[PDB]
Amino acid sequence: VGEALEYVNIGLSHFLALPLAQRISLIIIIPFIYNIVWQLLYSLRKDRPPLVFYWIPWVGSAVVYGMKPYEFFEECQKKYGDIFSFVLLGRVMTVYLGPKGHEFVFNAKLADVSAEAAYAHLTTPVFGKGVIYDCPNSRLMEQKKFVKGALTKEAFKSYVPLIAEEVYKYFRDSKNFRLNERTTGTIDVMVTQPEMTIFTASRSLLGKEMRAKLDTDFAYLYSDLDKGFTPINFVFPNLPLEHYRKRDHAQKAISGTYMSLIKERRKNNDIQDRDLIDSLMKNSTYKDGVKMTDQEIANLLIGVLMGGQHTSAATSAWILLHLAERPDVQQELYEEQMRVLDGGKKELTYDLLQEMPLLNQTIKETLRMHHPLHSLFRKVMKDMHVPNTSYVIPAGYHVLVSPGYTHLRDEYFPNAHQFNIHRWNNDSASSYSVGEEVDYGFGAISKGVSSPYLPFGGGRHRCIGEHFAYCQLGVLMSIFIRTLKWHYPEGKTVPPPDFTSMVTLPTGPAKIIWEKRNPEQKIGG
Template sequence: MAALKELANGVKDLSVYLYLVFMALPIYQRASIVLLLPFIYTLVWQFVYSFRKDRVPLVFYWIPWLGSAIPYGMQPYEFFADCQKKYGDVFAFVLLGRVMTVYLGPKGHEFVLNSKLADVSAEEAYTHLTTPVFGKGVIYDCSNARLMEQKKFVKGSLTRDSFANYVPVIREEIFKYFKSSENFRLGERSHGRTNVMSSQPEVTIFTASRSLLGEQMRNKFDASFAQLYSDLDKGFTPINFVFPNLPLPHYRKRDEAQKKISRTYMELIEERRKNNDIGDRDLIDTLMKNSVYKDGVRMTDQEIANLLIGVLMGGQHTSAATSAWFLLHLAEKPELQEELYEEIMRVSEGKDVTSDMLLKMPLVNNVIKETLRMHMPLHSIFRKVMNPIPVNGTSYVVPRGHHVLVSPGFAHLSAAYFPQPEVFNPHRWDTETTSTTDEGTVDYGFGAVSKGVSSPYLPFGGGRHRCIGEQFAYVQLGTILTTYIKTIKWKLPEGARVPEPDYQSMVTLPLCPAEIDWELRTKN
C-alpha cells in the first residue's frame, strides 16, 4: 500500500514538473505543442492499432477526429473502391470521431443487415439524426419492437386495393402541377426548360400527400409546404449525424419546419377527433383507429403526427431523387422515351393507366429498377455495435461502440455484378436476375419479408429495417413516369450531360443545374 502511495506521489510530482516546464516555454512553443499533440496521438494510436490481429485494417489518416470524412463525404463509392483495392472487402475508417467498419458486397449485406438485434442497433446509430426531423416517440426514437409495430400500422394503407385508388389521384395531381407550376404552365406554353430538382420534390410531396393523407390534407399543401419538407431534408447531412443541434441556419430552418408540419397534422387530427369524423379515407384515419401496440398502449396524437412526417419523408427521399434521375437519363435517350410511349399505349389502349396496367409494363418498371441501381438514394447504411461481433471467416472482431457500414449502392455499381455498370440500360433487366437461393421469409412484426439479403441488388435495404414502401414507390414512380411520357417529350439542353451525383447530403441527388428542355407531345 505504501509503495502504491509513493508511486502515486511520484506521478503527481512528475506531472507538476512537466507542467512547470511547459509553462516556462515561450508562448509560440506552447501553442505548437498543443497543436501537435492531437496529431502525435493520432499517429501513435494508429500504430498501436495496426498490431492488433483482431481488428480489421484501418484506413490511414492524418487529421485527428476528422479521419477520412472528406474523401468519404465527397465521393463515397470512389473511396470504397480505393480502400477495397488496398484492404479487401472489409476495412475500417474514422469518420468524425467514429470508427466505421465497412463490409462491401453481398456478404457484407448479410453481415450487417441480418445481424442479431442484440448485437447491432439502427436506433442507436440514427436517433440523434432522425428525432429532430420526425419528432419524439417514432421511427428511431423508440424501441425496435415499437418501430416494427409502427411499420405494421402504416402498412395497412399500402395494399393492392389502396394502390388502385392512388393511381388516378396521383395522375390528377401531376396534371394540376403541369398546369399551375412555373416549371411547366401547360396550357399557356407548349415547351420550356425545367429544373428537375425544383419540380420533382414538389411533384413527389403533392402526389404522396394526396394519395396517402387524403384530399383534406393535400389542400393544406402548397409550394411553401413543399419547401418546409425541403428544409427538413436538409437536416439529413453528415454534420447532423455528429452534431444533432448547432446554432446554424439550416438547423433553425429544420426545427421550424418540423414544428409547422407537425402542427398542421395535429390540427387535422384534432378536428377529426372533435367531430368524431374517423373513417377509412386515408392513412390518418388508419392510424387514428388502429395504432394500438400489443401491450395495449395507444400512440398519442402527437406521435401519429410525427409518424406521418416520417412516412412522407421516406417517400420524399426515394421518389423525388429517383424521378429526377430517370427524367435526366431519359433526356439522353429519346428513342427510349418512344419505346416507353409505345408500351404504355399498347397496354393501356390509349386509356388512363391503372395500377393493374402498371404491373404489365416491364419497360416502365425496368426504368425505375435501373434508376435505383445507378442511384440508390442512401449510399451508406449504418448500425451501432452493441456487443462485439466476429467477422465470419476472419480473426476480426468489431468491438462494442464502433459502427458497421454497408453500401448496397456500391455493389449496384460494380462490374462484378452488373456489366457496364456506368451505363443506364433498363433492358439489362429483361434477362438479368438478382435472385438468390430462396431462404424463406420472416416476420419482424410488420408482415413477412425475405430472410435473404445476400443479393447484390438491394435498393430498399433488407432485414427488419427493409423499407415497407417499395410497392408504393413503384406505383407512385410508375404513375409519374407514364404521365410524363404520355404528356411531354424532353431532352437535355444543348451541350449538357446528365449531372454527376451530389453525395454531400445523406441522399444521392443530381448536382445542379439539373435541367431538361421539354415540349408538349403531339398525340398520334
C-alpha cells in the same frame, strides 16, 4: 537516480512555464504525433480489420468519404479487401463491402447492432419524438406494420388516379410547364421533382386537406423541416445556429396541423379509408395495448412523407436525366404505353401499371445506378466476430453497409456503368425473395439478404415503401412519357451525383428541355 524523477518533475515545471507560442504548438503537435503512432500500433492487431491511414485526428477520412464515397470504397477495397475501417468525425466506421457485407449488417442479431443508436440524433429532431428511432426497436416494428397497413393494393388502386390528377394538375399550373400555354420549355428536374413528389405524396397519403395546405405559405414549413434533415445534423445535431430552429418550429407547426385534422376527424367521425391519416387513426394500437398518442401518430406521418419525399424525388430526377439522352428508351416506353392503355383510350389503373414491365425496368435500373442512400449505418452494441476471419468489431464501433456500391460493380452487373433497362428483361419486380422468409413484426420479408441488387435493404430495418414508391414513380413516369418528349441542352449530359447531401441526388442545375407530344392537347379543369 530518483534524481531522474526529480527531472520529470523539473521538466514538467518548465513545460507549464514556456511561451504560449510553443505551448499551442505543442497542443497541436502532441495529438498529431500521438495518433500517427497509435495507428502503426493498430496495424499490428489482427483481431481488427485494416484501418485506413489519416493525418488529421478526429476528422479522419471524412473529406474524401463525404465527397466521393464509392471512390473511397473502391481504392479501399483494392488495398484491404471487403472489410476495413476508417475514422470519421470522431467515430470509427467498419465497412463491409459486397453481399456478405449485406448479410453481416442487415441480418445482424438485434443484440449486436442498433439502428436507433445510429440514426436517432438526426431523425428525432425532424420527425418528432415517440416514434421511429425514438422508441425501442420493437415499437418501430409495430409502426412499420401500422404504415404498411395503409400501403395495400386497394390503397394503390385509389392512389393512382389521385396521383395522376396531381401530375396533370402540375403540368397545367406549374411555372415550369404550363402545357395549355406552352408546347416547349426548360425545367430543372431538381426543382420540378421535389414539388411533384410532395404534391402526389401529400394528396394520396395525407388526404386532400393536407394536399391543399401545400398551395399556401404553409408549404414553406415543409421546406424548413427539410433543411434540418442534413448530415451536419448527424455530427452537430444541436448547435444554436438558426436553420436548426425553423426546423423545430416547422416540426411542431406541421405536426400541429395533422393533430388538428386528426382530432377534428375523430370528433365528427370522418374516419373513412381515404388516406394514411384515416388508417393510422383506425389502427395504431400496439400489442401490449398502449396506443399511439395523437402526437406520435402525427410524428410518424412526418417521418413517412419525409423519407419518401427524398428517395422518390431523387429517383424520378435520375430517371428523367438518364432518359433525356435516350430517345430510344423513350420511344420504347411510349410503345408500351400505347399497347397497355390502348393508344390512350384506357385509363391508368394500379393493375395496368403492373403490365408495364419496361416502365418498371427503368425504375429498377435507375435505382440500380442511383441508390438514394450510399451508406447505411448501425452502432455496434456487442463485440461481433466476422465469419471466416479472426476479426473482431468491438462494441462502440459503427458498421456501414453499401448495397449501392455493389450495384455499380461489373462483377455483379455486366457493364455496371451503362444504363440498360433490358438487363432486367423478364425480371421487372421491385424486388423479390429468392426463397425463404421471416417476419419481424411487419410481415414476411426475405430471410436472406445476399442478393447483389438490394435497393431497399433487408432485415428488420428493410423498407416498407417500395410498392408505394413504384406506384408513385409509375404513375409519374407513365404520364411524362405519354405527354412529353425531352432531351438535354447542347453539350449537356448526365450529372455526377452530389454525395455530400442526404440522398445521392444529381449535381444541379440539371436541366432538360421538354416538348409536347401533342402541342394542341389541353389538360382540362
